[PDB]
Amino acid sequence: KAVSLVEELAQKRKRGDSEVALAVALVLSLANKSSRNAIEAAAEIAKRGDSEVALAVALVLSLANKSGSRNAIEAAAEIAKRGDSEVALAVALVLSLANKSGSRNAIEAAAEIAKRGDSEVALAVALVLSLANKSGSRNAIEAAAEIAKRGDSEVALAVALVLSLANKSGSRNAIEAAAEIAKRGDSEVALAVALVLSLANKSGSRNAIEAAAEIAKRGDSEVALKVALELSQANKSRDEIEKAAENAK
Amino acid sequence: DKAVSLVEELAQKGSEEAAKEIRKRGDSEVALAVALVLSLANKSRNAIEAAAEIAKRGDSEVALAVALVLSLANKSGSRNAIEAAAEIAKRGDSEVALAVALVLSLANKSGSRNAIEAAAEIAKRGDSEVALAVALVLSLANKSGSRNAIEAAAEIAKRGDSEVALAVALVLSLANKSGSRNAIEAAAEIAKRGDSEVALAVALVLSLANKSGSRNAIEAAAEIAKRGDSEVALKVALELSQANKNGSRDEIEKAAENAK
């Protein structure tokens, strides 16, 4: 029967694998209601006969119609032509997260990442998006959009570190400053701060963590590294962690 | 019509009604999606039980993500990964299913069984942030083409720490853009070590070396990475950062030699 649904949707088998059959029906059912290139791409997948790939494409395609951005529909077509499940999935995440983002910058950025089709960028962007969506600050979501727009794997990975590290500190000041760093959008500041926060949390001193949030807010790359040095060596005297924290204050 | 038929036929087969609801809505994407979800459940008990929750939801995005994770749980052929996928299907969060799909898919394409073992663990923990961060380290190890990095990625994935994975994926990524085979070589050494403070401190140096655009700086940075001394990376990072700000092409090469 599945071949019938794929055959009807195709026309409008010899292998006989249900999943592939249904999977492709999706790829064609989604293409036929979309972009001439989209329909053409969906066909190429059907000829491929890959269970995993057909779904990822349909998924990126399903997410392409939800945003509406034809650039997303056209970008999904090229990913369908590339036929790499890694690229499709990572773009699915960025697209899915941009939709749940509630930001048109994020949606516009996500479509841009789809065109470029860089797997590494989309995943790192999807991280920064996943964190901004959980942070609950309108400014952070736009910071992520700005980051995703730049299409830089390093800033996304450096900012995601800072956001992730702040969320584990439970310190509103640290989170407040973390969103500030994403706005600034500087890879060198985020990493220098990512160290400080990482080293404060590991030392497990609220005064160290809050001192770090102070450093982050100030956003002075050299100062974070100076404290990172002072904080690192103490980690290697609970009496002393407070000293370097106060000094950083 | 066939969509509701295929879903209904598979729905009759020990299913827990929902098919009538989906049929009443008459959405193909949801219908084909759920059909795939149930089809994958039948051949695979909690999965069959879990798939019904998806069917009643009538959500196109979740059904595919779940079906995808299910499809990959079959190709891995690891029972633990099947059960893990069922718990994710019970949640019905397309984000977790997607991020886990990647880790599972990337672990399958890696060829390391430690990795596939790890990928299954990630599905059980169902941590959206860890699955993505690991997927990075995995995606980067599969592209590096050094069997040790893949096993390094498996170890990282095994520990289930988003910080170490994000710090390591940073150095690996930073090394791949350096074009320096020794930097890439040292980057694989860092991931094996598995130290977050070391990788970050090194990620800094590399970030600064690449930015300054001095091959001496990069090769010096790679030397630092090989040593793996966190305190020494930050010292050079400070010396390197301040040259990147002034732009003294004569100075950058000076602090690069100092790092040796």
Numbering used by the authors:
A (entry chain B): 8 to 19, 33 to 54, 56 to 257, 260 to 272
B (entry chain A): 7 to 19, 21 to 23, 27 to 54, 57 to 272
From the article:
We also expressed a C2 dimer directly as an eight-repeat duplex (C2HR4_8r), and the structure by X-ray crystallography to be close to the design model (r.m.s.d. compared with design model = 3.78 Å). The twist of the crystal structure is approximately 22.5° per repeat or 16 repeats per turn, and hence by propagating this structure from 9 to 17 repeats, the angle between the N and C terminal repeats can be modulated from 180° to 360°.
Here we describe a systematic approach to generating modular and rigid repeat protein oligomers with coincident C2 to C8 and superhelical symmetry axes that can be readily extended by repeat propagation.
